[PDB]
């Protein structure tokens, strides 16, 4: 489908509530494999298992290795914009 931009609100004591797989070294996007119930990703209601995370807060993750992408994602705070597309 189309690119969507979705806002997630994460409190400082919370994680994002996603499992992510993929990355440049695998020739696939950064992908959401699980959405954990009640955590910020679930609450925003705009993200699905199978979504590729193209960018977070304007950080392009289309050509980044797994670990680096996870690091960038885990550094995000507050109101976080995900640019996603369903694969």
């Amino acid at each position: 489908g189309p690119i969507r931009k979705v806002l997630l609100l994460k409190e400082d004591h919370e994680g994002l509530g996603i499992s992510i797989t993929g990355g440049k070294e695998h020739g696939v996007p950064i992908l959401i494999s699980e959405i954990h119930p009640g955590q910020p990703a679930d609450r925003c209601g705009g993200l699905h298992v199978g979504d590729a995370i193209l960018a977070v807060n304007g950080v392009n993750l289309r050509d980044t290795k797994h670990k680096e992408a996870v690091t960038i994602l885990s550094q995000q705070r507050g109101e976080i914009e995900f640019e996603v597309v369903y694969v």
């Binding site: 499992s19 993929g22 696939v28 699980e34």
Partner: peptide, 15 residues
Amino acid sequence: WXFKKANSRLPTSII
């Protein structure tokens, strides 16, 4: 539907 490379068993992180 079907076979997407992005569905294959790959290293995963929980965040």
